[PDB]
Design a protein around this ligand. Structure first.
Ligand SMILES: [Br-]
Ligand SMILES: [Br-]
Ligand SMILES: [Br-]
Ligand SMILES: [Br-]
Ligand SMILES: [Br-]
Ligand SMILES: [Br-]
Ligand SMILES: [Ca+2]
Ligand SMILES: [Ca+2]
Ligand SMILES: [Ca+2]
Ligand SMILES: [Ca+2]
Ligand SMILES: [Ca+2]
Ligand SMILES: [Ca+2]
Ligand SMILES: [Ca+2]
Ligand SMILES: [Ca+2]
Ligand SMILES: [Ca+2]
Ligand SMILES: [Ca+2]
Ligand SMILES: [Ca+2]
Ligand SMILES: [Ca+2]
Ligand SMILES: [Ca+2]
Ligand SMILES: [Ca+2]
Ligand SMILES: [Ca+2]
Ligand SMILES: [Ca+2]
Ligand SMILES: [Ca+2]
Ligand SMILES: [Ca+2]
Ligand code: NA
Ligand code: NA
Ligand code: NA
Ligand code: NA
Ligand code: NA
Ligand code: NA
Lengths: 175, 175, 175, 175, 175, 175
């Protein structure tokens, strides 16, 4: 099947969403769900020796300003495999402009890892961890000559509002 | 496609079955085949720092008392990736009650790893290895507050009889 | 879906082909795409403690003399996951007879890893690396009692001609 | 040299101690510093498929009731290699009796990972993580037939007092 | 210190020997103990994509016909780190001539992994595993142009006799 | 022993030097040889999700402007373990100022990996790989607030001249 089109955005939107993971934490390979076939594709290898600091993927049945599904970052202790579904609780949102496009990213934790039970908003995350994620997105494209701007972080409510917006952008694009 | 519904239970049932692996040996993440979409899903992260001692999954087109496909444990030297099909020879069966449900698990070896050619019954397995598997299932849910009981091990013939039962439970559930 | 039948051979054939990876570099497990279901299958475990020196897979919508899709070897620094699509530039071809069947294999590099930008023909590859790949295929089946013969390497143009041949063998087999 | 005898307990005892790591997080092999030669030794393989949830080792120039150097658990994101020195801040202590011996264990974070800058006492640690560590020590010896009892957790000040005690036990044993 | 010269051959020679591991199972890098400094050294990278099928190292205070300490192969489930001491029970011996030198290798299991408790002689090892080890040593130097000959396997008593011989060769060389 | 002080700079200086590796490629942990004890120490965890693109360490019996042994980067396919000695051929040098100190770094390949036999000067390295290494050093300290400047790359002869300089700086510092 095609996970992007055929999975709902979540079981309890926007408190709990599905994250379909494309890139496990620790990868330098930039995998993406091929929206046409539903297969994993290598988009590129990052040009710098950086690794994804989070399990990285999409919320199904969403769309966004960069012409792709809405980006989601899930904090996993043990990374998952590509194309794994995780039930995720949004706790904040990274505000990023990428090559002139709004490209904000939900920050979420797995509902079903009790380690994260007390992570519910952006203030629960170690500051240095937010900084490491922002810095990755600030510099990972530098050798590609693409401009990114990290504006800061929003809280869980702002993240949830943006999830609802992305869900509507999908309905409008794909009727 | 949906591997659970669209794959036969095996090529030479019950001497050789297909094992569709959900969890590679060494994982703490409890992956499962999502029976609705056919995608891998993170059910939960184990609450304790334990890892699956076997490649763990299901026999396709089976059903069982816990309301899931029949559980199978494949002894792999190098773990496979989730959603890999392995041709497996049943050699025994772990007798487990889980939260009040019968939830026995086939123990099998890969037909096409010659390392295991002389493993054909439960007496061929190192005792300490059977004990390690049983102990994992005895304690892995303890922090979840769920009761499990490991009653012992049955031999290859008992395992094969249970495989035939599970194949019939599927036909009856899904007509 | 079924990647073998439903993916085109490439976006710019034969300069750029799709490689659907079955076996990540470093694996001893011989995974293959199950042509019937589209799932990954463990064909066997290699009988010797050897590992695949390349990310190994197939070109979609091709066929070959051994009754399988055309084999492709992609040089990846970080191995991909099974069933990942890579856009690959053919740079040469390994000439192999396997159990009496022609079973040549394209050698390719990822288009979107800039590390390999200057790899465009067989003369760009370290000699010892070509030798290591050939030796793997010379000896990996020795304990299986199967005869293989490595005849040498052809250049990028010869590889591209063989890709076109394999594309035609598929059209003829599957009408 | 011999790290146990020739390294000081820490640079700013008891606020900052040296942890000499024996077992990286994720290991099932129970490595220990051989107090005679200073080499790493495999004491045993754990009898169950459990892994160390922390980087595990000793504080140099300490001694304890079980006739070994004082145990320390360092929370590392990326595990270190055996025999690595880490500057560690004690934040709490696990109260354990092991086979009739007091065998409490310092819980510490690396000073020089900014991720942990705000971890300073036992209340800063996710409850489920404390539970996972305690459960590991509650059950990891069960198949060895050895009795352990986990009594609970003490805070950073109690941990620091115990570090000072262990430093004195060493001076007395080794004059 | 220098592990080769300053560690005894074993705690209960020849029933239990110390194996000082140089190369973890799964490595392609050919590490060796530098007999001069006691540090690990990269001797070479194997010329073929083969990996050590066993944890590989030496028995301390031994010497052998190839002008090196006596080779020992320890069957570990989880590989150890280089320079780890393992208490090992010899169960057999691989008979190998290497570049004209006798270079037999003890096959052993860890005393303190209960998985191997019933492995006590060469007949306890899966035939395919013995074949995989022999084949590795038959072919791993082929691209280096060095001749090796594998003559077969001896039993535990023959292995123990050879351990005693190697212990004496050391005493004579190093007085 | 103490590898920094007790190992010679190389077997054929400056054509072949010893590299004592501190940090395997792929690590985010910044390990260093503790010059006092000879043990591995965690200096810090990098503040960003970057990994060392090379096996990273020192040339023994050298000194440099930043008050440390001369830095060396060895291109290894399979990373080594910390404190491994590699015989390395210098092929170039990265020109870096770090926090106001000259802190150039030799780029080298392992003599005994035939894959690199034709790598002998800076022009043999893929441009994108040089760029990835430079970019790592340009940005890896950015969150630490430390200024680095990468000025470019010198060739093998310039690297060899700098190795001779560093060897002399050591003799003068340590008499
Ligand atoms: Br994304
Ligand atoms: Br299951
Ligand atoms: Br193939
Ligand atoms: Br300890
Ligand atoms: Br050896
Ligand atoms: Br350095
Ligand atoms: Ca995009
Ligand atoms: Ca983007
Ligand atoms: Ca995006
Ligand atoms: Ca269930
Ligand atoms: Ca169950
Ligand atoms: Ca079940
Ligand atoms: Ca075939
Ligand atoms: Ca073939
Ligand atoms: Ca083929
Ligand atoms: Ca003890
Ligand atoms: Ca204890
Ligand atoms: Ca203890
Ligand atoms: Ca030798
Ligand atoms: Ca030899
Ligand atoms: Ca030898
Ligand atoms: Ca420095
Ligand atoms: Ca520096
Ligand atoms: Ca430096
Ligand atoms: Na995306
Ligand atoms: Na199940
Ligand atoms: Na194939
Ligand atoms: Na201890
Ligand atoms: Na040796
Ligand atoms: Na340095």
């Amino acid at each position: 099947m095609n996970p992007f089109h055929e999975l709902e955005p979540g079981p309890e939107v926007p408190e709990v969403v599905y994250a379909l993971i494309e890139i496990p934490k620790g990868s330098r390979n930039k995998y993406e769900l091929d929206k046409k076939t539903g297969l994993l594709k290598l988009d590129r290898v990052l040009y710098s020796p950086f690794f994804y600091p989070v399990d990285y993927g999409i919320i199904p049945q969403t769309w966004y300003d960069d012409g792709d599904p809405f980006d989601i970052m899930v904090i996993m202790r043990e990374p998952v495999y590509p194309l794994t579904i995780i039930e995720a609780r949004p706790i904040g949102i990274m505000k990023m402009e990428d090559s002139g496009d709004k490209d904000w990213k939900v920050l979420a934790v797995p509902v079903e890892d009790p380690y994260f039970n007390d992570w519910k908003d952006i203030s629960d995350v170690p500051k240095a961890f937010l900084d490491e994620i922002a810095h990755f997105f600030q510099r990972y494209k530098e050798l590609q000559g693409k401009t990114t701007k990290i504006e800061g972080w929003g809280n869980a409510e702002e993240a949830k509002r943006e999830i609802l917006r992305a869900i509507e952008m999908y309905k409008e694009k794909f009727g």
